[PDB]
Design a protein around this nucleic acid. Structure first.
Length: 187
DNA sequence: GCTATAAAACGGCA
DNA sequence: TGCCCTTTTATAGC
Protein backbone atom coordinates (compact mmCIF):
# COMPACT_ATOMS: atom_id res chain seq x y z
CA UNK A 1 0.00 0.00 0.00
CA UNK A 2 1.23 3.49 -0.89
CA UNK A 3 0.96 5.10 2.55
CA UNK A 4 1.24 8.54 0.92
CA UNK A 5 -2.16 8.22 -0.81
CA UNK A 6 -3.72 5.92 1.83
CA UNK A 7 -2.54 7.03 5.29
CA UNK A 8 -5.01 4.58 6.84
CA UNK A 9 -3.33 1.63 5.14
CA UNK A 10 -6.64 0.48 3.61
CA UNK A 11 -7.59 0.94 -0.05
CA UNK A 12 -11.31 0.85 -0.89
CA UNK A 13 -12.17 -1.65 -3.60
CA UNK A 14 -14.37 -0.35 -6.41
CA UNK A 15 -17.56 -2.39 -6.72
CA UNK A 16 -19.63 -0.69 -9.45
CA UNK A 17 -19.23 2.03 -12.08
CA UNK A 18 -21.86 3.82 -14.16
CA UNK A 19 -20.76 5.40 -17.44
CA UNK A 20 -22.48 7.07 -20.37
CA UNK A 21 -21.62 7.32 -24.06
CA UNK A 22 -23.39 8.49 -27.21
CA UNK A 23 -23.22 6.17 -30.21
CA UNK A 24 -24.47 9.23 -32.15
CA UNK A 25 -27.04 7.53 -34.38
CA UNK A 26 -30.70 6.67 -33.89
CA UNK A 27 -31.32 2.98 -33.27
CA UNK A 28 -34.27 0.66 -33.91
CA UNK A 29 -34.70 -0.75 -30.41
CA UNK A 30 -37.41 -3.17 -31.54
CA UNK A 31 -35.04 -4.69 -34.10
CA UNK A 32 -31.99 -4.75 -31.82
CA UNK A 33 -33.82 -6.93 -29.28
CA UNK A 34 -34.95 -9.31 -32.03
CA UNK A 35 -31.51 -9.93 -33.55
CA UNK A 36 -29.23 -9.85 -30.48
CA UNK A 37 -29.10 -13.03 -28.41
CA UNK A 38 -28.89 -11.47 -24.94
CA UNK A 39 -31.22 -8.47 -25.12
CA UNK A 40 -34.64 -7.78 -23.61
CA UNK A 41 -36.93 -4.89 -24.49
CA UNK A 42 -40.25 -4.07 -22.79
CA UNK A 43 -41.07 -0.48 -23.83
CA UNK A 44 -44.06 -0.42 -21.47
CA UNK A 45 -41.66 -1.07 -18.58
CA UNK A 46 -38.62 0.95 -19.69
CA UNK A 47 -37.76 2.73 -22.93
CA UNK A 48 -34.48 0.88 -23.41
CA UNK A 49 -33.01 -2.42 -24.54
CA UNK A 50 -31.36 -4.22 -21.61
CA UNK A 51 -28.31 -6.13 -22.87
CA UNK A 52 -25.58 -7.94 -20.93
CA UNK A 53 -22.13 -9.29 -21.75
CA UNK A 54 -20.03 -11.85 -19.90
CA UNK A 55 -16.60 -10.17 -19.90
CA UNK A 56 -16.54 -7.76 -18.36
CA UNK A 57 -19.72 -8.68 -16.45
CA UNK A 58 -21.85 -5.59 -17.12
CA UNK A 59 -25.35 -4.49 -18.09
CA UNK A 60 -26.05 -1.89 -20.78
CA UNK A 61 -29.12 0.30 -21.26
CA UNK A 62 -29.40 1.17 -24.97
CA UNK A 63 -31.87 3.86 -26.03
CA UNK A 64 -33.40 4.74 -29.39
CA UNK A 65 -31.77 8.19 -29.24
CA UNK A 66 -28.35 6.52 -29.51
CA UNK A 67 -27.30 7.13 -25.90
CA UNK A 68 -26.04 4.26 -23.76
CA UNK A 69 -25.60 3.58 -20.04
CA UNK A 70 -23.11 0.96 -18.82
CA UNK A 71 -23.38 -0.42 -15.28
CA UNK A 72 -21.76 -3.10 -13.14
CA UNK A 73 -18.08 -2.79 -14.07
CA UNK A 74 -15.32 -2.91 -11.45
CA UNK A 75 -12.91 -0.38 -12.97
CA UNK A 76 -13.11 2.70 -15.17
CA UNK A 77 -11.15 0.83 -17.84
CA UNK A 78 -13.47 -2.17 -17.56
CA UNK A 79 -16.47 0.16 -17.94
CA UNK A 80 -14.97 1.74 -21.06
CA UNK A 81 -14.02 -1.71 -22.36
CA UNK A 82 -17.51 -3.12 -21.87
CA UNK A 83 -19.06 -0.03 -23.47
CA UNK A 84 -17.00 -0.51 -26.64
CA UNK A 85 -18.06 -4.15 -26.71
CA UNK A 86 -21.74 -3.13 -26.71
CA UNK A 87 -21.09 -0.49 -29.38
CA UNK A 88 -19.48 -3.03 -31.72
CA UNK A 89 -22.41 -5.40 -31.11
CA UNK A 90 -24.68 -2.63 -32.40
CA UNK A 91 -22.39 -2.09 -35.41
CA UNK A 92 -22.46 -5.76 -36.43
CA UNK A 93 -26.27 -5.44 -36.57
CA UNK A 94 -25.97 -2.69 -39.19
CA UNK A 95 -26.00 0.56 -37.28
CA UNK A 96 -23.40 3.31 -37.90
CA UNK A 97 -22.49 3.69 -34.24
CA UNK A 98 -19.60 5.72 -32.85
CA UNK A 99 -18.08 6.34 -29.39
CA UNK A 100 -18.71 10.01 -28.63
CA UNK A 101 -18.19 11.69 -25.24
CA UNK A 102 -17.59 8.69 -23.01
CA UNK A 103 -17.86 9.77 -19.38
CA UNK A 104 -17.72 8.09 -15.98
CA UNK A 105 -20.80 9.21 -14.05
CA UNK A 106 -20.68 7.34 -10.73
CA UNK A 107 -18.24 5.14 -8.83
CA UNK A 108 -19.15 2.81 -5.95
CA UNK A 109 -16.51 1.61 -3.51
CA UNK A 110 -16.51 -0.34 -0.27
CA UNK A 111 -14.00 -1.26 2.41
CA UNK A 112 -13.65 -2.70 5.91
CA UNK A 113 -12.06 -0.96 8.91
CA UNK A 114 -12.19 -4.29 10.79
CA UNK A 115 -13.55 -2.95 14.10
CA UNK A 116 -17.05 -2.15 15.40
CA UNK A 117 -18.26 1.46 15.35
CA UNK A 118 -20.53 3.39 17.72
CA UNK A 119 -22.93 4.93 15.20
CA UNK A 120 -25.07 6.97 17.61
CA UNK A 121 -21.97 8.53 19.17
CA UNK A 122 -20.82 9.38 15.65
CA UNK A 123 -24.21 10.88 14.78
CA UNK A 124 -24.19 13.04 17.91
CA UNK A 125 -20.89 14.86 17.29
CA UNK A 126 -21.23 15.03 13.48
CA UNK A 127 -24.96 15.76 13.25
CA UNK A 128 -24.44 18.48 10.63
CA UNK A 129 -23.35 15.76 8.16
CA UNK A 130 -24.90 12.51 9.39
CA UNK A 131 -28.32 10.86 9.49
CA UNK A 132 -28.88 7.80 11.69
CA UNK A 133 -32.33 6.18 11.70
CA UNK A 134 -31.82 2.52 12.63
CA UNK A 135 -35.48 1.52 12.13
CA UNK A 136 -35.54 2.98 8.60
CA UNK A 137 -31.97 1.97 7.60
CA UNK A 138 -29.40 0.27 9.88
CA UNK A 139 -26.49 2.38 8.56
CA UNK A 140 -25.50 5.98 9.22
CA UNK A 141 -25.67 8.27 6.18
CA UNK A 142 -22.63 10.58 6.09
CA UNK A 143 -22.88 13.34 3.47
CA UNK A 144 -19.33 14.63 3.04
CA UNK A 145 -19.03 18.11 1.55
CA UNK A 146 -15.34 18.09 0.53
CA UNK A 147 -15.31 16.13 -1.65
CA UNK A 148 -19.09 15.81 -2.15
CA UNK A 149 -19.44 12.10 -1.38
CA UNK A 150 -22.01 10.05 0.53
CA UNK A 151 -20.83 7.30 2.87
CA UNK A 152 -22.88 4.53 4.49
CA UNK A 153 -21.30 3.45 7.78
CA UNK A 154 -22.35 0.26 9.56
CA UNK A 155 -21.85 -1.13 13.05
CA UNK A 156 -19.61 -3.92 11.73
CA UNK A 157 -17.09 -1.44 10.28
CA UNK A 158 -17.99 -2.01 6.62
CA UNK A 159 -18.24 1.18 4.57
CA UNK A 160 -19.99 2.05 1.30
CA UNK A 161 -18.70 5.03 -0.69
CA UNK A 162 -20.72 6.34 -3.63
CA UNK A 163 -21.18 9.52 -5.65
CA UNK A 164 -17.67 9.86 -7.11
CA UNK A 165 -16.85 10.66 -10.73
CA UNK A 166 -13.12 10.09 -10.08
CA UNK A 167 -11.63 7.27 -8.01
CA UNK A 168 -9.53 9.78 -6.03
CA UNK A 169 -12.61 11.38 -4.46
CA UNK A 170 -13.47 7.87 -3.27
CA UNK A 171 -10.03 7.58 -1.68
CA UNK A 172 -9.98 11.08 -0.18
CA UNK A 173 -13.46 10.61 1.30
CA UNK A 174 -12.39 7.40 3.05
CA UNK A 175 -9.20 9.00 4.38
CA UNK A 176 -11.20 11.92 5.79
CA UNK A 177 -13.57 9.55 7.62
CA UNK A 178 -11.00 7.02 8.87
CA UNK A 179 -9.71 9.02 11.90
CA UNK A 180 -13.32 9.79 12.84
CA UNK A 181 -14.26 6.10 12.71
CA UNK A 182 -11.35 4.96 14.89
CA UNK A 183 -12.30 7.76 17.29
CA UNK A 184 -15.67 5.99 17.70
CA UNK A 185 -14.27 2.45 17.80
CA UNK A 186 -16.41 0.17 19.95
CA UNK A 187 -14.05 -1.15 22.63
C1' DG B 1 -39.00 -8.84 -1.23
C1' DC B 2 -38.90 -4.04 1.04
C1' DT B 3 -36.12 -0.08 3.50
C1' DA B 4 -31.27 3.78 1.75
C1' DT B 5 -27.02 5.83 -1.37
C1' DA B 6 -25.13 7.75 -5.87
C1' DA B 7 -25.51 8.33 -11.25
C1' DA B 8 -27.12 8.43 -16.20
C1' DA B 9 -30.47 7.58 -19.92
C1' DC B 10 -36.15 7.84 -21.75
C1' DG B 11 -41.28 8.22 -21.42
C1' DG B 12 -45.49 9.93 -18.84
C1' DC B 13 -47.48 13.82 -15.98
C1' DA B 14 -48.18 17.95 -13.65
C1' DT C 1 -37.35 21.01 -13.48
C1' DG C 2 -40.04 18.38 -10.39
C1' DC C 3 -42.13 13.34 -9.58
C1' DC C 4 -42.06 8.63 -11.16
C1' DC C 5 -39.83 5.05 -14.19
C1' DT C 6 -34.69 0.74 -14.67
C1' DT C 7 -30.06 -0.99 -14.18
C1' DT C 8 -25.79 -1.76 -11.05
C1' DT C 9 -23.17 -2.43 -6.30
C1' DA C 10 -21.45 -2.78 -1.74
C1' DT C 11 -23.82 -2.69 3.03
C1' DA C 12 -27.80 -4.68 6.78
C1' DG C 13 -32.24 -4.89 9.36
C1' DC C 14 -37.28 -5.78 8.81
Amino acid sequence: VDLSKHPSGIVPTLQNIVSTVNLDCKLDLKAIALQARNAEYNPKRFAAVIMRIREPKTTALIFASGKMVCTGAKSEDFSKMAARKYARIVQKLGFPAKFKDFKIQNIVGSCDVKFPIRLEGLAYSHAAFSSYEPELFPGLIYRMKVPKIVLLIFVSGKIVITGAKMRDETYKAFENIYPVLSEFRKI
